[PDB]
Amino acid sequence: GSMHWNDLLNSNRRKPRQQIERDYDRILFAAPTRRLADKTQVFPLDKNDSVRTRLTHSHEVANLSRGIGMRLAFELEDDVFKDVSEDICLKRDVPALLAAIGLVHDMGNPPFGHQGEKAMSEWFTKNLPEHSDNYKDKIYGDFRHFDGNSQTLRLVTKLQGYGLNLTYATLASMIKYPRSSESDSSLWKKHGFFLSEKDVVQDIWNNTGLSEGVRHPFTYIMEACDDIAYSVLDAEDIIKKGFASFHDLIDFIQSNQFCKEDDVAKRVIENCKKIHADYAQQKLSPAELNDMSMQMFRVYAIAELVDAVVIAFKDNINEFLNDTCEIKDLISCSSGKNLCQALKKFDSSRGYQHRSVLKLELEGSNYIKGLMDMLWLGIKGRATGDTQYDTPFGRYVYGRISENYRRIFEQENNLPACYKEAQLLADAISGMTDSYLIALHDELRALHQYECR
Amino acid sequence: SMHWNDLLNSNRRKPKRQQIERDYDRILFAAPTRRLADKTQVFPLDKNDSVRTRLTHSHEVANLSRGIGMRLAFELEDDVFKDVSEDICLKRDVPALLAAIGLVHDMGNPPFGHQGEKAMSEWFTKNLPEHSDNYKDKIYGDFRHFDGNSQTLRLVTKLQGYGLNLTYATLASMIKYPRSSESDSSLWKKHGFFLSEKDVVQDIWNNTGLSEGVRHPFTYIMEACDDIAYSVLDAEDIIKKGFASFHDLIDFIQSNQFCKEDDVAKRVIENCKKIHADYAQQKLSPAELNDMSMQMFRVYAIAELVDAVVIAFKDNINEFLNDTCEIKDLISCSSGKNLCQALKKFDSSRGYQHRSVLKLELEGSNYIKGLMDMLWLGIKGRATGDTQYDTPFGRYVYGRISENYRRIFEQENNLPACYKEAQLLADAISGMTDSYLIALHDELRALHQYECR
Ligand SMILES: [Mg+2]
Ligand SMILES: [Mg+2]
């Protein structure tokens, strides 16, 4: 069985310019997209150094995906789009679809970078014990292993009961891991949607020809663009902040075990050496020379990695279009896997373990866990029938939660009451920016003095 | 007349996908583009509000321009683009070109909104007297009537002899007002480039078939998209911040003298009234109902204004391609001019004159003028020869200026010394963000205590 591009590019919407272009416009004009500007990506955003935030990273991923779609729809059309209905305009739909899924991919991630997800998962693991009878079911893993992709899908499908009313193609491409926490798929080790979205994704799977464990072909492209953006622009930011030099990056790539014989890595290194041989002649500050060489390396590396990803996607298009697809990621099957791995290693060694990043992660973990404690004081028991929340502090912290999250929490559905409370807490925490989370944590800590003692 | 072959010149100024797409890619990854996220657009940046910044406004304008380009290249190609070489791929160039010029249109604008430009102009008028023999030429008007478009062109052309190396089509499109301060024309009341770029612009005009007073056709589209974004999105921000309600906007449009018996305004009003009546049934908080109604109004108004702009551009394409074009703006020749004027009046009455915006403007003016005084203390005389600047405070404030601006200032050219010093100050002030400008102002004020008295 092979999936068809007519179903994968379904322009219909769940609620009973091209449609996909309108989807991209709605995603861009959405409030969470603008809120992404205040969410930390890797490095602290308080510093005035033009460091990457979630919004800038999302826009870069969207641009890379749009360029890949441009190449796919204009150059390699007959190679990958073999059987497409005439009413579908690939040149207008594919770039727009890739740009939209790139822009929206990190919309539901919690603040404070990766430490946000890690802290939420740790708090949920501690406060929703797996041995306890209330939180024994695997569905609560949705919070014990909380992931931003499921929250993003929930945000785009249930927050407004259809949300932004994205097309089926967009929603299908949003699902990064086609399985839930209840599922036991060996191919994917992470859940891609919550239990509350279990019906919705099913509807998507009923309109795009997809099923559990089967990924949309454009999801691979979006993930590859995300990985490329991470690996390249994190290194660029590392050099920009002065945590390392361009020569340090070149030496790290050259001395990497898998990049000594890698053709792409050697080509990039040679081109960067040639350019740096000319950039040093002009009178430039060491920071200025580092920035120039870093920009040139970014251009070369992004071009090479994007070309390798496009080639890999074109070569493995038949495997992607088949339901029995075992490809993990597009980078791993491409010729640029070694360079991307080396860049990720460099980013981990030089940027992710720097003093500033570690301090930011520690502060984010502290803030998130404290705020989750104070909010759980007012959330727990609301749906299970208990009354322990009915305190002035509990009422206040419940009133501080955004009204849409509370409205979804006070609804009739098959979700267990404990699951509803945990989902309310997760929705409240995930949608917060760094500054808003810190301010709310400080205010609640100030107001909690009597009840805490 | 003018041919599209020259207007869409993909050649780059520096002597030696698509080139024009590469222009948008380079603009997106530029550091000042990321710095735009820290510059206020109209309203101050809060910790919770999703008000537009310069970056979000630029992205919205770019999206609108890209949609216009898709409509022009995919539907109205025969009506708009006649006698175009088969080498030029309109479907890939026109949308990319419009998006690139929309994203870059506000790169060089000073911080603190429009008050930034106003404060820079007032300070330059006071400290560069027109009666003083040192400053009598019209060239110093470049600073007495400082404009963000000229600084944007300067940044893209002379900041990295070439900067981003944008194509000739892009550079021609970013010239909003095709005239200089020295040249006096009744067509345009503002200068579009500095004296230092006179040779660059003359080059661009040579490679695009344009001339003084003749504006690139896509500049009209970019300006129309900028105006539409300004009006509609500022109204949306006003509603979101709570300064006015959706019913207030509806009443203002209905009670507007020109918007009466206006087809576009009536259509938008009726559609929004029906949608609001439908929405009122759902139990939502007043803020939520206002947000939903304003979002639907934004969708309807943006669609109507964009369609009117497209129709006006298509109808007047022959005049736009003529060197004797007398059109001042695309909106005024469209059917949506009345709605745009009413929206601008509503924004001025409720948003721009709100106490928060007035306080932001006053603080920005104070900060900008104080910092300009303290920087002029260390800049003045560096090029004329007089050595009042050679003080520890002057040396420090000169060292705090960005190295690239200082390097351009120290270059030997035909610019007068006073012009070079004023341009150094303008480049320093314009490139700062709000927070960085405030921090530098506080630092210098702390360090200026002894030398002040
Ligand atoms: Mg990402
Ligand atoms: Mg603008």
XYZ file of N, CA and C in Angstrom, chain A residues 104-317:
642
model
N 4.920 26.810 12.526
C 4.080 26.414 13.652
C 4.697 25.306 14.499
N 5.845 24.757 14.096
C 6.325 23.513 14.693
C 6.654 23.656 16.177
N 7.081 24.837 16.621
C 7.465 25.050 18.012
C 6.515 26.000 18.734
N 5.264 26.074 18.283
C 4.337 27.057 18.830
C 3.881 26.709 20.241
N 3.789 25.425 20.570
C 3.318 24.990 21.868
C 4.387 24.565 22.850
N 5.653 24.847 22.575
C 6.708 24.457 23.496
C 6.683 25.344 24.738
N 6.962 24.788 25.912
C 7.001 25.595 27.130
C 8.198 26.526 27.124
N 8.204 27.542 27.982
C 9.322 28.490 27.999
C 10.600 27.853 28.523
N 11.672 28.648 28.480
C 12.975 28.290 29.048
C 13.639 27.140 28.288
N 13.422 27.084 26.977
C 14.122 26.129 26.136
C 13.759 24.686 26.439
N 14.740 23.800 26.241
C 14.523 22.376 26.487
C 14.288 22.109 27.966
N 14.884 22.936 28.825
C 14.709 22.758 30.258
C 13.259 22.965 30.661
N 12.493 23.698 29.860
C 11.075 23.826 30.130
C 10.355 22.496 30.073
N 10.540 21.772 28.966
C 9.953 20.443 28.846
C 10.500 19.508 29.912
N 11.810 19.569 30.163
C 12.398 18.674 31.155
C 11.827 18.932 32.546
N 11.681 20.203 32.923
C 11.154 20.544 34.237
C 9.685 20.174 34.359
N 8.899 20.407 33.305
C 7.500 19.994 33.346
C 7.383 18.484 33.503
N 8.203 17.730 32.765
C 8.176 16.277 32.880
C 8.576 15.824 34.277
N 9.616 16.435 34.847
C 10.051 16.051 36.186
C 8.983 16.360 37.226
N 8.362 17.538 37.131
C 7.313 17.892 38.078
C 6.132 16.942 37.965
N 5.726 16.609 36.739
C 4.596 15.704 36.568
C 4.935 14.299 37.048
N 6.176 13.859 36.837
C 6.593 12.557 37.343
C 6.555 12.523 38.864
N 6.995 13.604 39.510
C 7.012 13.622 40.969
C 5.606 13.739 41.546
N 4.759 14.574 40.948
C 3.454 14.881 41.517
C 2.328 14.016 40.969
N 2.589 13.199 39.951
C 1.624 12.224 39.444
C 2.314 10.869 39.462
N 2.454 10.261 40.639
C 3.213 9.009 40.741
C 2.598 7.909 39.889
N 3.463 7.144 39.222
C 2.983 6.045 38.394
C 2.478 4.886 39.242
N 2.998 4.737 40.461
C 2.536 3.671 41.341
C 1.179 3.983 41.956
N 0.838 5.262 42.094
C -0.436 5.638 42.685
C -1.595 5.188 41.800
N -2.723 4.887 42.445
C -3.892 4.403 41.720
C -4.503 5.475 40.829
N -4.418 6.744 41.233
C -5.010 7.811 40.435
C -4.253 8.034 39.134
N -2.938 7.839 39.139
C -2.089 8.157 37.998
C -1.327 6.928 37.532
N -1.974 5.766 37.578
C -1.334 4.523 37.170
C -1.426 4.277 35.670
N -2.469 4.784 35.018
C -2.663 4.531 33.597
C -1.560 5.187 32.774
N -1.288 4.601 31.605
C -0.247 5.126 30.730
C -0.619 6.469 30.119
N -1.898 6.848 30.156
C -2.313 8.115 29.559
C -1.634 9.282 30.262
N -1.433 9.169 31.576
C -0.759 10.222 32.320
C 0.702 10.366 31.926
N 1.261 9.392 31.205
C 2.564 9.593 30.601
C 2.597 10.817 29.711
N 1.455 11.154 29.097
C 1.326 12.388 28.326
C 1.888 13.588 29.072
N 1.824 13.569 30.400
C 2.419 14.620 31.209
C 3.727 14.200 31.858
N 3.902 12.909 32.149
C 5.162 12.465 32.732
C 6.292 12.529 31.716
N 5.966 12.407 30.431
C 6.928 12.590 29.354
C 6.450 13.710 28.442
N 6.059 14.832 29.045
C 5.451 15.934 28.311
C 6.339 16.390 27.161
N 5.729 16.563 25.991
C 6.427 16.972 24.783
C 5.692 18.141 24.143
N 6.462 19.035 23.521
C 5.892 20.247 22.961
C 5.084 20.043 21.697
N 5.337 18.962 20.957
C 4.608 18.737 19.712
C 3.133 18.456 19.971
N 2.839 17.618 20.967
C 1.450 17.337 21.309
C 0.742 18.597 21.782
N 1.432 19.425 22.569
C 0.837 20.678 23.013
C 0.591 21.619 21.843
N 1.497 21.638 20.865
C 1.287 22.469 19.683
C 0.063 22.012 18.901
N -0.090 20.698 18.731
C -1.263 20.180 18.036
C -2.541 20.512 18.798
N -2.509 20.370 20.123
C -3.658 20.736 20.941
C -3.981 22.217 20.795
N -2.947 23.058 20.760
C -3.144 24.495 20.619
C -3.805 24.831 19.291
N -3.333 24.215 18.205
C -3.877 24.539 16.891
C -5.224 23.887 16.628
N -5.612 22.875 17.411
C -6.878 22.199 17.166
C -7.990 22.541 18.149
N -7.671 22.984 19.368
C -8.684 23.115 20.409
C -8.731 24.491 21.062
N -7.894 25.435 20.643
C -7.765 26.720 21.332
C -8.369 27.842 20.492
N -9.618 28.186 20.793
C -10.263 29.377 20.247
C -11.584 29.648 20.961
N -14.938 24.566 18.234
C -13.888 23.720 18.769
C -12.941 23.191 17.711
N -12.480 24.083 16.832
C -11.567 23.709 15.763
C -10.320 24.580 15.697
N -10.194 25.580 16.559
C -8.991 26.396 16.573
C -8.854 27.216 15.306
N -7.660 27.187 14.716
C -7.355 27.972 13.526
C -7.962 27.394 12.256
N -8.545 26.199 12.322
C -9.165 25.540 11.175
C -8.161 25.360 10.037
N -7.029 24.755 10.378
C -6.018 24.435 9.385
C -6.500 23.304 8.487
N -5.923 23.231 7.291
C -6.277 22.169 6.364
C -5.790 20.822 6.886
N -6.360 19.752 6.328
C -5.960 18.412 6.740
C -4.498 18.140 6.423
N -3.990 18.685 5.317
C -2.582 18.498 4.983
C -1.682 19.116 6.046
N -2.001 20.341 6.468
C -1.202 21.005 7.492
C -1.234 20.227 8.799
N -2.430 19.846 9.250
C -2.550 19.123 10.512
C -1.837 17.780 10.450
N -1.940 17.084 9.317
C -1.236 15.817 9.162
C 0.272 16.015 9.227
N 0.779 17.079 8.600
C 2.210 17.349 8.661
C 2.655 17.819 10.041
N 1.735 18.335 10.860
C 2.103 18.758 12.208
C 2.458 17.568 13.090
N 1.817 16.424 12.868
C 2.013 15.265 13.735
C 3.415 14.716 13.491
N 4.332 15.000 14.414
C 5.721 14.586 14.275
C 5.928 13.117 14.622
N 5.241 12.623 15.647
C 5.327 11.221 16.034
C 3.943 10.596 15.960
N 3.649 9.784 14.954
C 2.281 9.270 14.760
C 1.909 8.178 15.759
N 1.964 8.519 17.045
C 1.564 7.592 18.094
C 1.278 8.378 19.364
N 0.539 7.745 20.267
C 0.215 8.309 21.568
C 0.980 7.574 22.660
N 0.895 8.112 23.879
C 1.548 7.466 25.013
C 0.946 6.097 25.297
N -0.350 5.926 25.030
C -0.968 4.614 25.175
C -0.396 3.617 24.178
N -0.044 4.079 22.983
C 0.534 3.208 21.974
C 1.938 2.770 22.381
N 2.387 1.672 21.781
C 3.687 1.080 22.066
C 4.498 0.904 20.788
N 4.530 1.939 19.953
C 5.268 1.864 18.700
C 6.767 1.819 18.966
N 7.446 0.856 18.341
C 8.897 0.773 18.454
C 9.598 1.800 17.575
N 8.984 2.175 16.450
C 9.620 3.114 15.531
C 9.819 4.476 16.185
N 8.810 4.962 16.901
C 8.858 6.266 17.547
C 8.860 6.078 19.056
N 9.821 6.707 19.728
C 9.958 6.603 21.173
C 9.263 7.733 21.918
N 8.591 8.636 21.210
C 7.865 9.732 21.829
C 6.439 9.765 21.303
N 5.519 10.193 22.162
C 4.136 10.380 21.755
C 3.983 11.707 21.025
N 3.136 11.716 20.000
C 2.974 12.901 19.184
C 1.696 13.674 19.432
N 0.765 13.091 20.183
C -0.477 13.780 20.497
C -0.993 13.301 21.845
N -1.807 14.145 22.469
C -2.396 13.841 23.760
C -3.587 12.902 23.598
N -4.050 12.370 24.730
C -5.269 11.570 24.719
C -6.468 12.411 24.301
N -6.511 13.671 24.741
C -7.619 14.553 24.395
C -7.714 14.808 22.897
N -6.621 14.627 22.158
C -6.620 14.784 20.711
C -6.767 13.455 19.984
N -6.962 12.358 20.723
C -6.990 11.033 20.111
C -8.025 10.953 18.998
N -9.204 11.536 19.214
C -10.209 11.566 18.159
C -9.751 12.431 16.992
N -9.248 13.633 17.288
C -8.955 14.603 16.235
C -7.949 14.030 15.248
N -6.835 13.500 15.758
C -5.823 12.930 14.877
C -6.417 11.791 14.062
N -7.301 10.998 14.677
C -7.967 9.934 13.937
C -8.699 10.506 12.735
N -9.450 11.590 12.948
C -10.118 12.248 11.834
C -9.109 12.667 10.777
N -7.976 13.226 11.207
C -6.922 13.579 10.263
C -6.453 12.336 9.522
N -6.220 11.248 10.260
C -5.799 10.010 9.621
C -6.868 9.463 8.691
N -8.127 9.843 8.898
C -9.200 9.406 8.022
C -9.348 10.279 6.786
N -8.657 11.418 6.727
C -8.787 12.324 5.598
C -7.511 12.488 4.790
N -6.374 12.004 5.283
C -5.110 12.130 4.578
C -4.508 10.791 4.183
N -5.192 9.683 4.449
C -4.657 8.377 4.132
C -3.589 7.881 5.076
N -3.337 8.591 6.169
C -2.333 8.190 7.139
C -2.947 7.273 8.191
N -2.093 6.765 9.073
C -2.524 5.887 10.151
C -1.481 5.950 11.259
N -1.733 5.202 12.329
C -0.808 5.171 13.453
C 0.544 4.624 13.020
N 1.608 5.329 13.399
C 2.955 4.931 13.072
C 3.436 5.371 11.707
N 2.564 5.952 10.891
C 2.927 6.402 9.554
C 3.046 7.919 9.570
N 4.208 8.420 9.170
C 4.489 9.846 9.197
C 4.143 10.482 7.859
N 3.654 11.714 7.911
C 3.453 12.474 6.689
C 4.807 12.749 6.041
N 4.917 12.635 4.714
C 6.229 12.840 4.075
C 6.845 14.199 4.357
N 6.032 15.251 4.465
C 6.578 16.578 4.721
C 7.025 16.752 6.165
N 6.582 15.876 7.067
C 7.072 15.924 8.439
C 8.567 15.642 8.491
N 9.046 14.730 7.642
C 10.479 14.471 7.570
C 11.239 15.714 7.129
N 10.714 16.428 6.133
C 11.363 17.647 5.660
C 11.386 18.700 6.758
N 10.266 18.868 7.461
C 10.215 19.851 8.538
C 11.191 19.500 9.654
N 11.274 18.218 10.014
C 12.210 17.796 11.050
C 13.653 18.009 10.612
N 13.957 17.717 9.345
C 15.304 17.949 8.836
C 15.655 19.429 8.868
N 14.712 20.290 8.481
C 14.956 21.726 8.539
C 15.151 22.191 9.975
N 14.375 21.633 10.907
C 14.542 21.965 12.318
C 15.932 21.582 12.809
N 16.388 20.379 12.452
C 17.713 19.932 12.871
C 18.807 20.798 12.262
N 18.672 21.139 10.980
C 19.659 21.994 10.326
C 19.712 23.352 11.008
N 18.541 23.928 11.292
C 18.494 25.227 11.948
C 19.155 25.170 13.316
N 18.776 24.184 14.132
C 19.434 23.981 15.417
C 20.946 23.962 15.249
N 21.446 22.988 14.485
C 22.881 22.736 14.431
C 23.653 23.941 13.907
N 23.125 24.628 12.894
C 23.897 25.696 12.267
C 23.760 27.003 13.039
N 22.529 27.449 13.303
C 22.377 28.746 13.949
C 22.764 28.715 15.421
N 22.714 27.557 16.089
C 23.245 27.505 17.445
C 24.750 27.736 17.449
N 25.465 27.142 16.492
C 26.895 27.407 16.365
C 27.152 28.866 16.014
N 26.325 29.432 15.132
C 26.477 30.842 14.787
C 26.304 31.728 16.014
N 25.302 31.432 16.844
C 25.093 32.197 18.069
C 26.236 31.989 19.053
N 26.784 30.774 19.108
C 27.915 30.500 19.990
C 29.101 31.374 19.609
N 29.394 31.456 18.311
C 30.498 32.301 17.868
C 30.171 33.773 18.103
N 28.917 34.167 17.865
C 28.530 35.565 18.027
C 28.682 36.024 19.472
N 28.291 35.182 20.427
C 28.398 35.541 21.835
C 29.828 35.493 22.350
N 30.768 34.981 21.562
C 32.145 34.878 21.987
C 32.486 33.629 22.765
N 31.550 32.689 22.903
C 31.844 31.446 23.606
C 32.844 30.585 22.849
N 33.031 30.844 21.559
C 34.009 30.135 20.749
C 34.334 31.003 19.545
N 35.362 30.601 18.810
C 35.807 31.323 17.631
C 35.530 30.496 16.384
N 35.617 31.160 15.230
C 35.432 30.463 13.963
C 36.501 29.397 13.764
N 37.748 29.714 14.115
C 38.813 28.723 14.029
C 38.555 27.549 14.960
N 37.943 27.800 16.120
C 37.580 26.704 17.011
C 36.569 25.775 16.353
N 35.564 26.341 15.684
C 34.581 25.519 14.985
C 35.228 24.727 13.857
N 36.120 25.365 13.097
C 36.789 24.670 12.001
C 37.635 23.523 12.535
N 38.371 23.764 13.622
C 39.191 22.715 14.216
C 38.331 21.581 14.755
N 37.198 21.912 15.376
C 36.308 20.877 15.887
C 35.766 20.014 14.757
N 35.375 20.638 13.645
C 34.853 19.871 12.520
C 35.947 19.009 11.902
N 37.147 19.569 11.732
C 38.236 18.814 11.121
C 38.656 17.636 11.992
N 38.717 17.837 13.307
C 39.146 16.786 14.218
C 38.039 15.798 14.553
N 36.809 16.046 14.110
C 35.731 15.100 14.355
C 36.010 13.791 13.630
N 35.721 12.678 14.307
C 36.092 11.369 13.780
C 35.387 11.071 12.463
N 34.097 11.386 12.373
C 33.316 11.059 11.188
C 33.391 12.120 10.100
N 33.974 13.282 10.381
C 34.072 14.354 9.401
C 35.443 14.446 8.746
N 36.389 13.586 9.128
C 37.696 13.603 8.480
C 37.613 13.129 7.036
N 36.749 12.158 6.754
C 36.577 11.632 5.409
C 35.256 12.041 4.774
N 34.406 12.769 5.494
C 33.114 13.166 4.953
C 33.300 14.188 3.839
N 32.688 13.919 2.684
C 32.869 14.793 1.530
C 32.254 16.167 1.766
N 31.039 16.209 2.315
C 30.361 17.485 2.535
C 31.129 18.328 3.545
N 31.557 17.706 4.645
C 32.297 18.437 5.666
C 33.615 18.965 5.119
N 34.338 18.140 4.358
C 35.602 18.586 3.782
C 35.389 19.732 2.802
N 34.344 19.647 1.976
C 34.058 20.723 1.033
C 33.737 22.023 1.760
N 32.908 21.948 2.804
C 32.556 23.146 3.562
C 33.792 23.740 4.223
N 34.630 22.889 4.819
C 35.834 23.372 5.487
C 36.769 24.037 4.487
N 36.940 23.430 3.310
C 37.829 24.007 2.308
C 37.315 25.357 1.823
N 36.008 25.459 1.565
C 35.447 26.735 1.132
C 35.606 27.801 2.209
N 35.373 27.432 3.469
C 35.505 28.396 4.555
C 36.951 28.834 4.735
N 37.900 27.907 4.591
C 39.310 28.278 4.644
C 39.660 29.249 3.526
N 39.174 28.977 2.312
C 39.447 29.872 1.193
C 38.887 31.265 1.452
N 37.666 31.346 1.982
C 37.060 32.651 2.232
C 37.789 33.381 3.356
N 38.114 32.669 4.438
C 38.822 33.282 5.556
C 40.212 33.748 5.152
N 40.812 33.111 4.143
C 42.092 33.586 3.633
C 41.990 34.987 3.048
N 40.820 35.372 2.543
C 40.614 36.706 1.994
C 40.022 37.684 2.996
N 39.168 37.213 3.908
C 38.538 38.113 4.868
C 39.530 38.711 5.856
N 40.671 38.059 6.082
C 41.626 38.545 7.068
C 42.442 39.732 6.575
N 42.491 39.963 5.261
C 43.285 41.070 4.736
C 42.732 42.418 5.183
N 41.415 42.592 5.125
C 40.811 43.852 5.527
C 40.931 44.050 7.033
N 41.118 45.304 7.433
C 41.269 45.646 8.845
C 39.936 45.428 9.544
N 39.831 44.328 10.282
C 38.615 43.974 10.994
C 38.961 43.578 12.420
N 38.070 43.908 13.347
C 38.225 43.460 14.717
C 38.088 41.939 14.782
N 38.697 41.296 15.784
C 38.540 39.837 15.908
C 37.087 39.398 15.964
N 36.236 40.158 16.656
C 34.808 39.860 16.645
C 34.223 40.028 15.249
N 34.633 41.076 14.532
C 34.102 41.315 13.193
C 34.539 40.225 12.222
N 35.813 39.832 12.283
C 36.292 38.752 11.428
C 35.593 37.443 11.765
N 35.396 37.178 13.059
C 34.668 35.983 13.465
C 33.247 35.998 12.922
N 32.573 37.147 12.991
C 31.210 37.243 12.479
C 31.161 37.040 10.971
N 32.101 37.635 10.235
C 32.127 37.462 8.785
C 32.335 36.000 8.409
N 33.335 35.361 9.019
C 33.605 33.962 8.714
C 32.449 33.071 9.145
N 31.819 33.390 10.278
C 30.675 32.622 10.747
C 29.502 32.740 9.787
N 29.254 33.941 9.266
C 28.177 34.120 8.300
C 28.448 33.338 7.022
N 29.689 33.383 6.530
C 30.012 32.626 5.324
C 29.879 31.125 5.560
N 30.343 30.646 6.718
C 30.192 29.235 7.047
C 28.724 28.857 7.153
N 27.907 29.732 7.740
C 26.479 29.464 7.833
C 25.872 29.314 6.449
N 26.221 30.220 5.535
C 25.688 30.144 4.177
C 26.081 28.822 3.527
N 27.374 28.489 3.572
C 27.847 27.280 2.901
C 27.237 26.026 3.517
N 27.251 25.936 4.849
C 26.747 24.750 5.527
C 25.250 24.582 5.317
N 24.485 25.673 5.392
C 23.048 25.577 5.173
C 22.761 25.134 3.747
N 23.476 25.701 2.771
C 23.272 25.288 1.386
C 23.562 23.803 1.208
N 24.700 23.339 1.732
C 25.076 21.939 1.559
C 24.094 21.004 2.253
N 23.707 21.329 3.488
C 22.791 20.469 4.228
C 21.414 20.435 3.581
N 20.924 21.584 3.109
C 19.626 21.617 2.444
C 19.668 20.804 1.159
N 20.751 20.932 0.387
C 20.868 20.150 -0.838
C 20.905 18.656 -0.538
N 21.658 18.258 0.491
C 21.719 16.847 0.860
C 20.358 16.333 1.310
N 19.629 17.138 2.085
C 18.305 16.736 2.551
C 17.351 16.578 1.376
N 17.401 17.509 0.422
C 16.538 17.420 -0.753
C 16.866 16.173 -1.563
N 18.156 15.883 -1.743
C 18.550 14.691 -2.491
C 18.060 13.433 -1.786
N 18.218 13.377 -0.461
C 17.764 12.211 0.289
C 16.254 12.041 0.187
N 15.507 13.144 0.268
C 14.056 13.064 0.146
C 13.644 12.581 -1.238
N 14.307 13.082 -2.282
C 13.983 12.648 -3.637
C 14.297 11.171 -3.837
N 15.423 10.703 -3.294
C 15.816 9.312 -3.495
C 14.900 8.354 -2.743
N 14.459 8.736 -1.545
C 13.642 7.874 -0.702
C 12.165 8.246 -0.738
N 11.699 8.861 -1.826
C 10.308 9.302 -1.881
C 9.362 8.107 -1.913
